[PDB]
Amino acid sequence: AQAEQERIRMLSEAKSQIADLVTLTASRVLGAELQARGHDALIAESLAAL
Amino acid sequence: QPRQVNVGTVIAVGDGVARLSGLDQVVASEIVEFPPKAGRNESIYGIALNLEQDSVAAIILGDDETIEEGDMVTSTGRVISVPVGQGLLGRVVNPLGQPIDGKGPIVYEKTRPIERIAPGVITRKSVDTPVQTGIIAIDALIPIGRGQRELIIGDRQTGKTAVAIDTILNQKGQGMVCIYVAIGQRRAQVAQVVGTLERFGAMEYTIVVSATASESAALQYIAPYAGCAMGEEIMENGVMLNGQLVKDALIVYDDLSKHAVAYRQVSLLLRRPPGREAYPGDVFYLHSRLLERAARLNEEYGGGSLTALPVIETQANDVSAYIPTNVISITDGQIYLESDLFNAGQRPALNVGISVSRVGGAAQTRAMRA
Amino acid sequence: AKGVIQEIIGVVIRAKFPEDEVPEIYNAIEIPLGNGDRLVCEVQQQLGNGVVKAVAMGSTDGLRRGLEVIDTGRPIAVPVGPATLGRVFNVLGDPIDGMGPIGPEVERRPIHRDPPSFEEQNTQAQIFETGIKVIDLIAPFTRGGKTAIFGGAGVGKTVVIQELIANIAKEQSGFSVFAGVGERSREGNDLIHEMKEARIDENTTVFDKTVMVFGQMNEPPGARLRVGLTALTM
Amino acid sequence: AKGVIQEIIGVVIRAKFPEDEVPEIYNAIEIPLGNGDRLVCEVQQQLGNGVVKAVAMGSTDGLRRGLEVIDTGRPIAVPVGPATLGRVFNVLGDPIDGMGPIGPEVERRPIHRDPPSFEEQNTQAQIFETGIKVIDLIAPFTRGGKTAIFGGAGVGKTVVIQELIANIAKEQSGFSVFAGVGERSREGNDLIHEMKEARIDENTTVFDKTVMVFGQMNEPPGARLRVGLTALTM
Amino acid sequence: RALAAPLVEALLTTAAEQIRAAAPRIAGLSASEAAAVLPADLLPQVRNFLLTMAKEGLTGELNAVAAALPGYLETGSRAVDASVTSAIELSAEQKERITRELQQRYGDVHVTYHVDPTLIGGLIIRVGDQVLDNSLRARLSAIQRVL
Amino acid sequence: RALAAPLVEALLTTAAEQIRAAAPRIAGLSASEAAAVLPADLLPQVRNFLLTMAKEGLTGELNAVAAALPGYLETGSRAVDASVTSAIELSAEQKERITRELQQRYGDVHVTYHVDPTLIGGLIIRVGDQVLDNSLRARLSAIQRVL
Ligand SMILES: Nc1ncnc2c1ncn2[C@@H]1O[C@H](COP(=O)(O)OP(=O)(O)OP(=O)(O)O)[C@@H](O)[C@H]1O
Numbered sequence A: 001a002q003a004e005q006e007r008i009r010m011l012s013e014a015k016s017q018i019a020d021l022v023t024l025t026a027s028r029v030l031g032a033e034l035q036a037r038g039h040d041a042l043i044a045e046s047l048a049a050l
Numbered sequence B: 001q002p003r004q005v006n007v008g009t010v011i012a013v014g015d016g017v018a019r020l021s022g023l024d025q026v027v028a029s030e031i032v033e034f035p036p037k038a039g040r041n042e043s044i045y046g047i048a049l050n051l052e053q054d055s056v057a058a059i060i061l062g063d064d065e066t067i068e069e070g071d072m073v074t075s076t077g078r079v080i081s082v083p084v085g086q087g088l089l090g091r092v093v094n095p096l097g098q099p100i101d102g103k104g105p106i107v108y109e110k111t112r113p114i115e116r117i118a119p120g121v122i123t124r125k126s127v128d129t130p131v132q133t134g135i136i137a138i139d140a141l142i143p144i145g146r147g148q149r150e151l152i153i154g155d156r157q158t159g160k161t162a163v164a165i166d167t168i169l170n171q172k173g174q175g176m177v178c179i180y181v182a183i184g185q186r187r188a189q190v191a192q193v194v195g196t197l198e199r200f201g202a203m204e205y206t207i208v209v210s211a212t213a214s215e216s217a218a219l220q221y222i223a224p225y226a227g228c229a230m231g232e233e234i235m236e237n238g239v240m241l242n243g244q245l246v247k248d249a250l251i252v253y254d255d256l257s258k259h260a261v262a263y264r265q266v267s268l269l270l271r272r273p274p275g276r277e278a279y280p281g282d283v284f285y286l287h288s289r290l291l292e293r294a295a296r297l298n299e300e301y302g303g304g305s306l307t308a309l310p311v312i313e314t315q316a317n318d319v320s321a322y323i324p325t326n327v328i329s330i331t332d333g334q335i336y337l338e339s340d341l342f343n344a345g346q347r348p349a350l351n352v353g354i355s356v357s358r359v360g361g362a363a364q365t366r367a368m369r370a
Numbered sequence C, D: 001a002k003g004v005i006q007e008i009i010g011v012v013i014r015a016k017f018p019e020d021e022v023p024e025i026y027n028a029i030e031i032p033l034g035n036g037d038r039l040v041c042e043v044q045q046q047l048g049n050g051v052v053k054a055v056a057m058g059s060t061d062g063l064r065r066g067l068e069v070i071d072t073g074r075p076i077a078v079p080v081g082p083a084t085l086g087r088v089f090n091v092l093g094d095p096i097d098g099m100g101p102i103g104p105e106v107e108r109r110p111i112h113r114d115p116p117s118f119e120e121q122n123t124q125a126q127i128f129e130t131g132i133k134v135i136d137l138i139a140p141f142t143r144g145g146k147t148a149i150f151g152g153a154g155v156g157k158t159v160v161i162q163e164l165i166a167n168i169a170k171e172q173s174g175f176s177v178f179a180g181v182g183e184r185s186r187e188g189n190d191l192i193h194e195m196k197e198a199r200i201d202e203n204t205t206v207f208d209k210t211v212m213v214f215g216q217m218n219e220p221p222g223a224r225l226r227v228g229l230t231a232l233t234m
Numbered sequence E, F: 001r002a003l004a005a006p007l008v009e010a011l012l013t014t015a016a017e018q019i020r021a022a023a024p025r026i027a028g029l030s031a032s033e034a035a036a037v038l039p040a041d042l043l044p045q046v047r048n049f050l051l052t053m054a055k056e057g058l059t060g061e062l063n064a065v066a067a068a069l070p071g072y073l074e075t076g077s078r079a080v081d082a083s084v085t086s087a088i089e090l091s092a093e094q095k096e097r098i099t100r101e102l103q104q105r106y107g108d109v110h111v112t113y114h115v116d117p118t119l120i121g122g123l124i125i126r127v128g129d130q131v132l133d134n135s136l137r138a139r140l141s142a143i144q145r146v147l
């Protein structure tokens, strides 16, 4: 039972690490896209609520 | 999905207490977020306790070394709340509902606010269904019934945690969901308790809410109220245990004296005026809020119940101290464990002469009562 | 007659009122909540410039630092009359029992009243006839006097209370009042309500002859402080 | 960086830094103090517009207001590794023995670290034979667990500790750490040195397997406060 | 009333002019140092206030006091200090465009544009004590919650 | 705005005091008449404020301008509560008379009127912490002498 619980914990930790790596990769891709296109296009979103 | 949030600036952060400057229209017990910044990728929440003119003194639910002067705090509109439901059974969670056993995320759909008003004046009912502790001395002489809050008061090492764990283990098939709130208890001892619960298969119906000693005094202060909210949800909505809609909860506060110490720490760091033994004035109110939420509701309100088993250590068997007398006044009965009886071979160590159960025979089976 | 909350520290609320409309020392503040009901505070200290420090009487876990407060002018007004008989009330006089609210026609009296003057006091102590042999022999009461029981649970204290109510209601007119100040909600409620509703005398339940006001331990300190005065007014 | 001391209250030093360069809660600041030796304070509180309250961990009895303070930007870093074996350190990790300073290549770890999580806790323990009848019979000394002796002034805490070290320090099967927080430098240390250097384990002394951090009774409050954390980091 | 208003406005303008002109006169210079630096470019009350400010040497933000002089004519309250943070350094045209755009409150409010390039392509606009955050770092965390 | 408080408050108080002091001497003057009447040694705004009102003939209201002069650089909350009690309910011209004779205490500070009909004649003037009673004091003093 302890081995099964450890396996479940390891699976959860692996899923968490995969999510963190995916978030880091998405952040890097978004940063590259912002550097290429330019953040100025987001300025129009300032009037959504303000 | 952009939204406008109220923002303040941390103008003074100290030993777990921060003055949040301008956070106007903040609710009196909100959760300030402290959004992540350079060097910290997570959010450290806090409880906005003192709403003073031009200041919001907030205790910090976490590590305050990362918070820096001038940091922006966003006031989440929600009052301090804890996730509740079926998903917490068998999980060790810190008082914020975040798992600390690393077995995955907590699957939940409802978050009940801690620090809720008592279940009601007329909504309760007479305590009749017994709680089978499994200890002959308790089950025969000092009965505990569903909906009765029974203090376990004793010296430093007499068997209080042992009695609580025996009670938790005995509720195998009696349709009871146990909760073990570990306030100020060392992490190794909480790990030992969890190992004992898992060894006897009592972790299929137990929720452990641990705010260990290293964790900030705010977490220890809210440690019992979370968990009490969990039991409130269990008695009000029920959980599917063994295919049955169990609506009975048995909550054990590991040490309310450590909770009172944590409240004293957060009050004195907030520079609130002290009282007796440096405790704040409203600490009897502190414990009466927590213990009066354990009730046996009538059939019109669900018929569920919440049984509380507070635990208190007394210095040199001084049951005349401030917190021990307060909680003795609050509770419906006392279980006195003495070192003199414990050493003399009486292992449960109950001082049956002075231990009392105000519910009495109504908390016993007719066979046991006879 | 409308002020703004300034500070909120636990169950103590500081509120700034206009200069010429500061509430008195025992008036009610009656903070209105969003969900329809109100939070009735009680002033305790006039200070500063239009600022009053008051006790919450409630949780104060949903209040900002700008909410309006409506001074009621008079202290906490509690319903008094034959209508408030056989009913359970809280510190504010709001009926907490299952039955409906008290009608507007019932007289409301201030919670704070002056005790009777010296001239009205009886010049000779008089025994109070309870009917219980041991009580009327060993420890006789006093008409307008105070008696304290020192007993735990399972000793029949509740039954003694019920019989005292029944005897005073039979031999005299004998309406009774019960203020549970800082009681366990289990002992004070649903084990006093049910026992007195079940207990009957001259086909009338004891609960029908008794008023109840309950400020329990869960309520803030102000409620437990003023529940006794509520019962005294009733 | 480059703040100025405002107040010197005991060993607590309040320093004002630029608005955007305030040190963190547990950072270490330094007073140059002249003479080529500096006073290392540890921040404890942040009070407002660049004002931070720190603990001197030193004499702090010859420095004036207005002295500059340099913010290191990191908490107290102490050497860790085999380089610390067989050496005696301060609270700051600076060796006080006659041997030379620890090299830059040795890793520096902060003395303020998170304790092990709930997952990492090891609840397995077994009896540790110590050779003392009362300890091995009534309250067995625990291998891999926490134990302590609570004694008054006149009782023999030091004698019991020294006997325990003599009994169990030869057959260590590992390294050892001794922290002398607030203890006499006569017996608590410098004669444990004599006993530890005299004991020999196969031509390697017990002192060669020991990291000893001191901070004893003579040191100001800050050193005694953080010497335990330094030893724990080592 | 009317005479007081013109008088108050004239006094405020004179004070602002004196502060702007003589702010750097006694700036930093100590009580003895700035005493000679103290020129006749101030009223006797203004000269006394400048001497008090420069006695310690904190006569650096006197221009802000100058900025405090005109607003005190109209009871101030026009600060509406807002702060805009975007990942890319703001170009002057778009900077002016968004300065004009936040006219819902007071118009071109006091805006201290920042960068903080840790953000990705978004806006963090804090007006008073209300902050609006459409930065893609915020969306990043709001998606990363899946963890 | 915060930095304004000391200097602006001092200048406004000086202007108010100068205008109030020159109110008796400079009454019903003109630009040149008040220039020869009002002292030119005062603040540059003070002399201008003294001359401009007289030039337009509003010099009588110039003292009232002084009343608003401190409040232009103050919270204007320290106005004496000069309570005026009189059994006869007072008309608007009566209240104007009372305030215009009451400006000798500070300025036209916050004045509140009450009736207390049991008074006869006279009026009770409670300025700050000094009370002048002139209504029923005579009768009750007489009844004290008689008894
Ligand atoms: N039959 C028994 N019943 C109860 N306690 C027992 C029994 N046999 C042994 N014990 C003792 O009880 C201990 C269990 O911990 P215990 O319940 O006394 O902790 P506690 O009262 O919470 O104290 P602490 O403050 O030290 O954590 C065992 O380690 C043992 O010393």
Ligand SMILES: [Mg+2]
Pocket (backbone or CB within 6 Å): B160, B161, B254, B255, B311
């Ligand atoms: Mg315990």
